Design an enzyme around this catalytic site. Structure first.
Site, mmCIF file in Angstrom:
data_model
loop_
_atom_site.group_PDB
_atom_site.id
_atom_site.type_symbol
_atom_site.label_atom_id
_atom_site.label_comp_id
_atom_site.label_asym_id
_atom_site.label_seq_id
_atom_site.Cartn_x
_atom_site.Cartn_y
_atom_site.Cartn_z
ATOM 1 C CG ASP A 157 -1.878 0.985 1.313
ATOM 2 O OD1 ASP A 157 -1.877 1.984 0.168
ATOM 3 O OD2 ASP A 157 -2.798 1.036 1.864
ATOM 4 C CG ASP B 114 -4.574 5.241 -0.104
ATOM 5 O OD1 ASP B 114 -3.485 4.214 -0.095
ATOM 6 O OD2 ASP B 114 -5.175 5.686 0.857
ATOM 7 C CG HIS C 136 -9.616 7.304 3.236
ATOM 8 N ND1 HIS C 136 -8.829 8.064 2.633
ATOM 9 C CD2 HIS C 136 -8.726 5.902 3.328
ATOM 10 C CE1 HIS C 136 -7.810 7.593 2.335
ATOM 11 N NE2 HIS C 136 -7.760 6.148 2.678
ATOM 12 C CG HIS D 45 -9.583 9.710 6.542
ATOM 13 N ND1 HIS D 45 -10.712 10.103 6.207
ATOM 14 C CD2 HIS D 45 -9.811 8.371 7.153
ATOM 15 C CE1 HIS D 45 -11.663 9.523 6.867
ATOM 16 N NE2 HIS D 45 -11.038 8.424 7.486
ATOM 17 C CD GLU E 53 -8.026 1.826 2.575
ATOM 18 O OE1 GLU E 53 -7.139 1.001 2.674
ATOM 19 O OE2 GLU E 53 -8.033 2.769 3.052
ATOM 20 C CD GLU F 261 -6.321 2.328 -0.794
ATOM 21 O OE1 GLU F 261 -5.194 1.989 -0.914
ATOM 22 O OE2 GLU F 261 -7.075 2.790 -0.068
HETATM 23 C C1 57R Z 1 0.069 7.793 8.420
HETATM 24 O O1 57R Z 1 -0.036 7.508 7.282
HETATM 25 C C2 57R Z 1 -1.236 7.219 6.832
HETATM 26 C C3 57R Z 1 -1.712 6.810 5.658
HETATM 27 C C4 57R Z 1 -3.175 6.645 5.306
HETATM 28 C C5 57R Z 1 -4.012 6.918 6.300
HETATM 29 C C6 57R Z 1 -5.463 6.514 5.951
HETATM 30 N N1 57R Z 1 -6.196 5.606 6.878
HETATM 31 N N2 57R Z 1 -6.974 6.254 7.928
HETATM 32 N N3 57R Z 1 -7.630 4.753 8.506
HETATM 33 C C7 57R Z 1 -7.154 3.780 7.933
HETATM 34 C C8 57R Z 1 -6.163 4.318 6.949
HETATM 35 C C9 57R Z 1 -5.342 3.308 6.244
HETATM 36 C C10 57R Z 1 -3.938 3.075 6.186
HETATM 37 O O2 57R Z 1 -5.714 3.521 4.970
HETATM 38 C C11 57R Z 1 -5.844 1.894 6.282
HETATM 39 C C12 57R Z 1 -7.374 1.681 6.785
HETATM 40 C C13 57R Z 1 -7.489 2.619 8.178
HETATM 41 O O3 57R Z 1 -8.895 2.498 8.652
HETATM 42 C C14 57R Z 1 -9.253 2.874 9.805
HETATM 43 O O4 57R Z 1 -8.040 2.925 10.794
HETATM 44 N N4 57R Z 1 -10.225 3.051 10.162
HETATM 45 C C15 57R Z 1 -10.717 3.267 11.750
HETATM 46 C C16 57R Z 1 -10.536 4.723 11.820
HETATM 47 C C17 57R Z 1 -12.196 2.678 11.981
HETATM 48 C C18 57R Z 1 -3.536 7.379 7.475
HETATM 49 C C19 57R Z 1 -2.300 7.530 7.636
HETATM 50 CO CO CO Z 2 -3.742 2.699 0.898
#
Ligand code: 57R
Ligand code: CO
Length: 369
Positions: free
Chosen positions: A142, A153, A222, A230, A255, A350
């Site tokens: 990813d 993404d 997201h 996000h 995703e 994704e």
């Molecule tokens: C610091 O680097 C990142 C990269 C991408 C994201 C974006 N993200 N925000 N939430 C999530 C993600 C990921 C990495 O997409 C994976 C899914 C994950 O869903 C999640 O945790 N859901 C709960 C809040 C219920 C955030 C930070």
């Molecule tokens: Co991703």
């Protein structure tokens, strides 16, 4: 200019007119009512509105072409025996070249996730991690690219043992289903329900045990904003979510995650991923190491995500306490690895989609997935 093998030529040099390839363009779904969206392909007001944002779509496309070319190259050489550090560095070196990294104007949008086995997301190695990729591993790659804060993404699962083939097929079909369901005026909960119905239609057998594939209920897709991975709308992967609607002009990361475990993740393992809180303003800091680190983050990352390896490579050392300070102050947030139970297998696919006025564009679609 033709691309080299291995890739080294920036995407921008491969399209000397500045016009990058479209992803997959889709007529939007019919409405509950039964009416088609063939009209949008054309409604004069919509074509003009679409064209008004063409520079934005074009930036997404340049970033998506970088993503397609990087991931094809990765698939050519990713093999058990490599360390996770070796994998991520080789991927990132290519991504930097093909995006033509230029400070905050073009670069890597977030660290290379390479989450293994029961870990579903947000693992990338820190320095000193000796983890070696194994034949039986299930590895979620990813990674993100951006041009002018227009983020791609997009993620896929690597395996070497065919025992996981049906689990990958399930999750891929679920992600495709989510992508098809998505549209302007579509209810986000409905996307989740659709994904979950597809995912759960699959049964898999791995080492003589059978499983019904479970969506990971507390992971989601997201919306995506400018320099904002996000942007605050969630795309569920199970039923029971919000009836909030998707809107014209939004961008989404669709995703899905499948598991043979509980279908729920928790935080585990050492954190590697961090990102400035988008909503925190300027905070004056006098503590000198903390001040210095926040300046480094503001210059190099802004509100984009980073990892510890990326601080190391800028020549920072013995920064952990200052990084903890910024987390404790709420200026930076940590994003630890997210894992299902020991012994479970997790997979991910994704894409990034553009809800353009005239059509839905799966901007990161390739001939691979
Ligand atoms: C610091 O680097 C990142 C990269 C991408 C994201 C974006 N993200 N925000 N939430 C999530 C993600 C990921 C990495 O997409 C994976 C899914 C994950 O869903 C999640 O945790 N859901 C709960 C809040 C219920 C955030 C930070
Ligand atoms: Co991703």
């Amino acid at each position: 200019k033709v691309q080299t093998d291995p890739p080294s030529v920036p995407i921008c040099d491969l399209y000397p007119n500045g016009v990058f390839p479209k992803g997959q363009e889709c007529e939007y779904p019919p409405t509950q009512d039964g009416r088609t969206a063939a009209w949008r392909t054309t409604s004069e007001e919509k074509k003009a509105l679409d064209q008004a944002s063409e520079e934005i779509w074009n930036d997404f496309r340049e970033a998506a072409e970088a993503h397609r070319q990087v991931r094809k190259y990765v698939m050519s050489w990713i093999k058990p025996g490599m360390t996770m550090i070796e994998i991520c560095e080789k991927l990132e070196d290519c991504s930097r070249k093909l995006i033509k990294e230029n400070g905050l104007n073009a670069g890597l949008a977030f660290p290379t996730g390479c989450s293994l086995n029961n870990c579903a997301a947000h693992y990338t190695p820190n320095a000193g991690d000796t983890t070696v990729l194994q034949y039986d591993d299930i590895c979620k790659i990813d990674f993100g690219t951006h041009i002018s804060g227009r983020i791609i993404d997009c993620a896929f699962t690597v395996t070497f043992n065919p025992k996981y083939d049906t689990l990958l097929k399930a999750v891929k079909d679920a992600t495709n289903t989510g992508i098809k369901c998505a549209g302007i005026d579509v209810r986000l909960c409905d996307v989740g329900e659709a994904i979950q119905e597809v995912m759960e239609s699959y049964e898999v057998e791995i080492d003589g045990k059978t499983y019904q594939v479970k969506p990971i209920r507390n992971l989601n897709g997201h919306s995506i904003g400018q320099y904002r991975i996000h942007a605050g709308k969630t795309v569920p992967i199970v039923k029971g979510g919000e009836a909030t609607r998707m809107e014209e002009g939004e961008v989404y990361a669709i995703e899905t995650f499948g598991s043979t475990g509980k279908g729920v993740v928790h935080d585990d393992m050492e954190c590697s991923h961090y990102m400035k809180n988008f909503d925190v303003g300027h905070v004056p800091i006098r503590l000198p190491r903390t001040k210095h680190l926040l300046n480094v983050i503001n210059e190099n990352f802004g509100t984009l995500a980073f990892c510890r390896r990326w601080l190391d490579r800028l020549g920072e050392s013995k920064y952990l306490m200052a990084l903890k300070n910024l987390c404790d102050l709420g200026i930076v947030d940590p994003y630890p690895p997210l894992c299902d139970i020991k012994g479970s297998y997790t997979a991910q696919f994704e894409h990034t989609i553009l809800l353009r006025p005239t059509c839905k564009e799966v901007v990161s679609r390739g001939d691979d997935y």
